Amino acid sequence: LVESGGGLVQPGGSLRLSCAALDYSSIGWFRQAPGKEREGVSCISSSGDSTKYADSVKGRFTTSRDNAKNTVYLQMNSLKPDDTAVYYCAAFRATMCGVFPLSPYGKDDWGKGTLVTVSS
Amino acid sequence: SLISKEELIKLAEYKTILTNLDEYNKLTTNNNENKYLQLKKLNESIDVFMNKYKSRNRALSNLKKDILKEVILIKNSNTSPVEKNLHFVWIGGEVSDIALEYIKQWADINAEYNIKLWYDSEAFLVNTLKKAIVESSTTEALQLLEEEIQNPQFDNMKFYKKRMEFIYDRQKRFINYYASQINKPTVPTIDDIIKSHLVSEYNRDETVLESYRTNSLRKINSNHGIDIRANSLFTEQELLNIYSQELLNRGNLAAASDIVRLLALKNFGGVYLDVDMLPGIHSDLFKTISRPSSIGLDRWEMIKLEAIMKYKKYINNYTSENFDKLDQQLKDNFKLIIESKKSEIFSKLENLNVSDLEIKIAFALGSVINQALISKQGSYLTNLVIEQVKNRYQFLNQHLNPAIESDNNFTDTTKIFHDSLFNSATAENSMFLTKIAPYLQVGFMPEARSTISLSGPGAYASAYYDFINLQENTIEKTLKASDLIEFKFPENNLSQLTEQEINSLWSFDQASAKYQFEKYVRDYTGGSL
Ligand SMILES: O=c1ccn([C@@H]2O[C@H](COP(=O)(O)OP(=O)(O)O[C@H]3O[C@H](CO)[C@@H](O)[C@H](O)[C@H]3O)[C@@H](O)[C@H]2O)c(=O)[nH]1
Ligand SMILES: [Mn+2]
């Protein structure tokens, strides 16, 4: 899983991250801020008909799946300083990313991930 | 509602106390938690004062004692009925027909209570994995000790200790395999990982494991099942990790259930019951059947239950062993009462009035036991128990992880953990170290009971001490009797002395261990067909 699209944004702006490989798996975006614990952000079912979001981003972020290009997007809007973090992606055999927005026990590698910074 | 500020000014840092009392004296919101929180602030300010200026302190102590009574007052002032939920927990495999029959008594007596049977949708194969680890280790130890198990003087403790070394080895191989699988780009389910490990390592057939897994899911769903993973029960990674280290590293489903029940009450409120509990017996019923002086109190409670099942057969094949042993006039007298009439047999819960600050708990032998609990959603005391559990696991994992991650067998890993606990410890909270020292043995050797001090009754007793004394994170301080029964689960509402309660599913005593070992030897030498 390759995470791409990150960069700077201004407070209030938008950004679209991409997670490139997934057809029969639920896919979740997660994030980790410097010095904070990882937290779930979004999840989308394999059909793409069901989604789930962290409370802090619900109604601001959306997630979609473009099966054809095996890639799930994270449409971020109304970016805030608290959204500053490295963003990682993962696929799940479980429905709706299991214990989302929490992480699987023991899972400590999520790929390279892509940094998002929202400042000043 | 204490002595007012002028009274304490006219009876005796200190300025903060007066306002802190003044804030509390004026504070007339209807939020019990805020009242308690303001009481707590005042107490710490008093304490600060006291230490730094070790004439004031005569009357500041008097206020301190008054504050302790105010806590009781706030708790007992506005009680209200608890939410009408009954929470049960069965994790790790298929729920049993016996457990379902016990839950059925509660439902039939309390149709207005919503029944939740919490399960782990990912973890139906945990008990199968534990069985495969334990049974394979039993054969290792029996064959290793073949020359000596034939000796009548053989110490059965030698068998349990040698078996533990194999158990520890095979638990570690599973968790290492789990760690590699969970770190794939596609996260598999826990049952995916166990299935794959059982098939490759223990020669389990994949289709039977899957057929058991799907069967467990269908049966629990048809029986009030609600999934702990999908219903956002866990909101803190730390608590999920504690649940997971018990579920996955140790195979201790009672410990895992200790976590789940606290989160269920925190999020929903209501009553938690272990699946071996039964509704209380209608009071006054068994005074007209007077009880012989040869049958003890605990036994007579058991005999009571055996009488109902004999004639009504609510639970099938319930034991009658204790009942049968006596006078047929008694049996006939019992037989007429039961046949003459469930609601006249069993007490209904109805309104269970509690403070929104508290949690109530069953008692056994004068000490709390968390097999039955009552709490409103989000109560302060439930959160204190949860904080106790996290604090205890923080200390355990600090000392256990270096031992467990070292490249060492069970005996040397145990010594590192044990030495980590004792070689540099302080005398304060000394008693807690002794109780958690056999942690790795819990479930697999007799008299290993660390769960009591981590996620079980010991966490509750310290939480109650926290609450009564307006503190947090107390370890080995215990309340006097009069403070403790403030939190007692009404005995009229609960039958604790059931058949299924007799056998613990996570621990065993020396007598059972000796009998089980002799059973292992008899089957080993005798062979099976
Ligand atoms: O495979 C299992 C085994 C047990 N349990 C759960 O564990 C609970 C406790 O089981 P039980 O066998 O009754 O254990 P106890 O012998 O009663 O011993 C303790 O079990 C827990 C350990 O702290 C707490 O209930 C209390 O301390 C105490 O009652 C059960 O009700 C279930 O909820 C499972 O979910 N799956
Ligand atoms: Mn029990």
Residue numbers in the entry:
A (entry chain D): 4 to 24, 29 to 127
B (entry chain B): 2 to 13, 22 to 63, 66 to 352, 355 to 542
Which of the paper's sentences describe this entry?
Two high-molecular-weight exotoxins, toxin A (TcdA) and toxin B (TcdB), secreted by C. difficile are the major virulence factors responsible for CDI, which lead to a wide spectrum of clinical symptoms ranging from mild diarrhea to life threatening pseudomembranous colitis. The sequences and three dimensional structures of TcdA and TcdB show a similar modular arrangement which could be divided into four functional domains: an amino-terminal glucosyltransferase domain (GTD), a cysteine protease domain (CPD), a delivery and receptor-binding domain (DRBD), and a carboxy-terminal combined repetitive oligopeptides domain (CROPs). Acidification in the endosomes then triggers a hydrophobic pore-forming region in the DRBD to undergo conformational rearrangements in order to deliver the GTD and the CPD across endosome membrane into the cytosol, where the CPD cleaves the GTD upon binding inositol hexakisphosphate (InsP6). Here we reported the co-crystal structures of VHH AH3 and AA6 in complex with TcdA GTD (residues 1-542) and a fragment of TcdA DRBD (residues 1073-1464, termed as TcdA1073-1464), respectively.
We successfully crystallized a complex composed of the GTD of TcdA (residues 1-542) and AH3 in the presence of UDP-glucose and Mn2+. Most of the interactions are mediated by the complementarity-determining region 3 (CDR3) of AH3 that inserts into a groove formed between the α8 and α11 helices of TcdA GTD, burying an interface area of ~909.6 Å2 with a shape complementarity score of 0.760 (45). The core of the TcdA GTD-AH3 interface is mainly mediated by extensive hydrogen bond interactions, complemented with salt bridge and van del Waals interactions. Of note, a loop linking the α8 and α9 helices of TcdA GTD shifts ~2.1 Å compared to the apo state in order to better accommodate the binding of AH3. As a result, N194 of TcdA GTD shifts ~2.9 Å to avoid a potential clash with K114 of AH3 and also establish three pairs of hydrogen bonds with the main chains of G113, D115 and D116 of AH3, while V198 of TcdA GTD takes a ~2.6 Å movement to avoid potential clashes with A98 and F99 of AH3. Complementing this core interface, twelve TcdA amino acids around the α11 helix and the connecting loop between α10 and α11 mostly contribute hydrophobic interactions with the CDR3 of AH3 to further stabilize the complex. Our crystal structure shows that the epitope of AH3 is located on the opposite side of the substrate-binding site of the GTD, and therefore it should not directly affect the glucosylation of Rho GTPases. In the presence of AH3, the Tm of the GTD increased by 5.1°C and 4.8°C at pH 6.5 and 6.0, respectively, and the stability of the GTD at pH 5.5 and 5.0 increased drastically as evidenced by its Tm values at 37.3°C and 35.9°C, respectively. However, the GTD unfolding was greatly inhibited by AH3 but not AA6.
